[PDB]
Amino acid sequence: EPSPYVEFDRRQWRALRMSTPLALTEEELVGLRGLGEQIDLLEVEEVYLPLARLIHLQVAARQRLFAATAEFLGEPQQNPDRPVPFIIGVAGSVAVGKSTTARVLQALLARWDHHPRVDLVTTDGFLYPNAELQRRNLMHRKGFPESYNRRALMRFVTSVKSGSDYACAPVYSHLHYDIIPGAEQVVRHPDILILEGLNVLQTGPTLMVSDLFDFSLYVDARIEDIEQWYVSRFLAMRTTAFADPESHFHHYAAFSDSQAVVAAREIWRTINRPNLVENILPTRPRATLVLRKDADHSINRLRLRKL
Amino acid sequence: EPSPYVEFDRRQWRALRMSTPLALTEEELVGLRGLGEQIDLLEVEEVYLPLARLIHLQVAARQRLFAATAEFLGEPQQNPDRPVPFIIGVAGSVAVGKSTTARVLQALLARWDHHPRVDLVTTDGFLYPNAELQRRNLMHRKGFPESYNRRALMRFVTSVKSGSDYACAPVYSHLHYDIIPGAEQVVRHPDILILEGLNVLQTGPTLMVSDLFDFSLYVDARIEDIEQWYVSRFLAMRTTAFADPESHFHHYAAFSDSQAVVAAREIWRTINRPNLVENILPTRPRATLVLRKDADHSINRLRLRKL
Ligand SMILES: Nc1ncnc2c1ncn2[C@@H]1O[C@H](COP(=O)(O)OP(=O)(O)O)[C@@H](O)[C@H]1O
Ligand SMILES: Nc1ncnc2c1ncn2[C@@H]1O[C@H](COP(=O)(O)OP(=O)(O)O)[C@@H](O)[C@H]1O
Ligand SMILES: CC(C)(COP(=O)(O)O)[C@@H](O)C(=O)NCCC(=O)O
Ligand SMILES: CC(C)(COP(=O)(O)O)[C@@H](O)C(=O)NCCC(=O)O
Ligand SMILES: [Cl-]
Ligand SMILES: [Cl-]
Ligand code: NA
Ligand code: NA
Ligand code: NA
Ligand code: NA
Ligand code: NA
Ligand code: NA
Ligand code: NA
Ligand code: NA
User: Fold this and answer.
1) Ordered domains of chain A (ranges, CATH)
2) Distances (CA, A) of A256 to A238, A253, A305, B272
3) What is the DSSP letter of A52?
């Protein structure tokens, strides 16, 4: 029965690398690797290289489209490099590794011929500040669609894709668990902008950032596996992130293994799992490429949208 | 403030016609005109020609994209004309004129160089049969999302865009107010497929036909104006459609002017208006081009998505 997708196994997807060159060292990879992520140079070669190639084939092709419209409007043939920024979305559950995937992708794309300006923006910088979340009674819903200033977000991405010279996004501190007063991330007419976040693929009764994506990724895994990853990372943070006295999770540092497992499981049960099931997972169907990971964080299956 | 859209007035949109030739006679136009629609050759020239041009510029550009993916997959460069069917969606409220717009567009595109096979499929053929609607208690919700066999619909469009040699759609009778037993519309690998219907632009927790559109139109008008058009058309049908003894609206033929106005207003109040406000209008934001009509059915404003 015909399908808009095409499934691959690592074997099949690996062959699509072709001549694509690997321009990243094991040392550079470490600096991009997030806590709990296994990614090695091999995976970058068999999985991330084919992806980078496909994306490179699409950037050119995507320009044909904006050009066609530009020609229809009679507008002057547009600037040879101040082109329409190519927007990439990276979605998935918390603790699934979106951070690593986006940072690795950014690195690969940056090391392409003629060195394209590749920016990466996470959506946590568009979360409402704690004070505002408290006001709306959303302090226990960080990550849910309603916890974001969606208009400011859509405004930012539209600015960038529309050719603005500079656009700014607020900044979120994981150490302080809130938006940083006065902090801003300035994006200046990049060639490629990667927008990473839990619900970047959401659709709605209004035009949303997902409507501006030229390509999108959805890092997937079995829900039980992701919970395990989450709990495991929670315990591990007792000596890294939570160890800092400024951490708003510092009281968790002292928790015992079982005490931490209980706490992590409750947060997952009451916050992250519901959000994944109700909001994130329902957006997976429209992702251009789904990276399916196994219990060991290994990407062993991929689903591409041919249509 | 940057925007993904661009607004035009008839004056501005008219200039975008360029050399586009008018290959339709006033007589051929009549056969495409629906009851209550004013469209004249002028409007076809100042509004439909620029549109046809833009669409022609995009068909080529859209092929670059599927080609890029085809190249990435190593697949053999695809058939010179058995290309990826270009899907066009036409949405809007009942009584807004989607019928005319789609039939006129189909005609214009058919009369293009090398004569492309342009099929037109309305979604009423995917409505559940009355018996099934009764079963689900939806006999007073024909037109609402839930009144359609959405999977069969998505299955049909996916088949066509995926390159199937032939795909079939059921057929709906407005005379019998139900699906015709044994009737089918066969679509055979057309170059362009126009899918017309109330909620064709809807998004959801599953991949939908709107996700397969390469271009989309939304025929718009002020809600009050559309109601007037609806009521007016209702009264007028007393001597056309309702006059037939087989019509399931034949008892309305005898209604007086005021009696018919009351009936039409109630159907609009309880069925069509709610559907427009709750389901149709919320899809307008993602339409490629919005044709804004004035009280006299005249398209005098257009909103295009540049992004
Ligand atoms: N409680 C926390 N304290 C400090 N840092 C955190 C905390 N939770 C998550 N982070 C870090 O911030 C980012 C959050 O990632 P998550 O939101 O878990 O998405 P993903 O795992 O797909 O990148 C990661 O770098 C994660 O390590
Ligand atoms: N009650 C009816 N009886 C017979 N034909 C109808 C009836 N209602 C609508 N139609 C016709 O079937 C099509 C319905 O159009 P509508 O569903 O009103 O969308 P639109 O006006 O945008 O084409 C039009 O051809 C309309 O004239
Ligand atoms: C800030 C996040 C919700 C992620 O936001 P995102 O950048 O994906 O928009 C997440 O990293 C986080 O800190 N969540 C707090 C609750 C939890 O630990 O599950
Ligand atoms: C069948 C329709 C709902 C239109 O369906 P569509 O082809 O847009 O999917 C409409 O033409 C219709 O007959 N509606 C019946 C109720 C009414 O007259 O408002
Ligand atoms: Cl919508
Ligand atoms: Cl969704
Ligand atoms: Na992880
Ligand atoms: Na920058
Ligand atoms: Na998932
Ligand atoms: Na929710
Ligand atoms: Na009409
Ligand atoms: Na046909
Ligand atoms: Na409307
Ligand atoms: Na509804």
Assistant:
1) 1-307 (3.40.50.300)
2) 9, 8, 45, 61
3) H
Query: Is the beta carbon of B142 within 6 A of some atom in ligand 2?
Result: no
A3 touches chain B (CB under 8 A): yes
Judged by a CB distance cut-off of 8 A, whether residue B114 touches chain A is no
Contacts of B170 (CB under 8 A, 6+ apart): B125, B126, B152, B179, B180, B183, B184, B185
Q: Residue B32, Cβ neighbours under 10 Å: how many? A: 20
Interface contact A4-B72, CB threshold 8 A? no
Distance in angstroms between the alpha carbons of the first and the last residue of chain A: 14
DSSP states along A207-240: --GGGG-SEEEEEE--HHHHHHHHHHHHHHTTTT
What secondary structure letter does DSSP report for B33?
Answer: P
Q: If we measure between CA atoms, which residue out of A151, A144, A147 comes closest to residue A132?
A: A147
The pair of structure tokens assigned to B187 is: 């679509």
C-alpha torsion sign, points B69, B73, B79, B80: positive
Q: Tokens 């940072």 appear where?
A: A103
Instruction: From chain B, pick out residues whose CB is under 8 angstroms from the CB of A54.
Output: 69, 72
Question: Which of A93, A96, A106 lies closest to A280 in space, CA to CA?
Answer: A93
* Residue B74, C-beta contacts closer than 8 angstroms, at least 6 positions apart: A15, A16
Residue whose pair of structure tokens reads 């209550």 in the numeric block: B36
d(CA A30, CA B297): 63
C-alpha span between A45 and A42 (Å, rounded): 5
Report CB contact under 8 Å: B72, A61: no
Resolution in A for the shown PDB structure? 2.5
Sort B260 into a burial class: Cβ within 10 Å, 0-12 / 13-18 / 19+.
Answer: buried
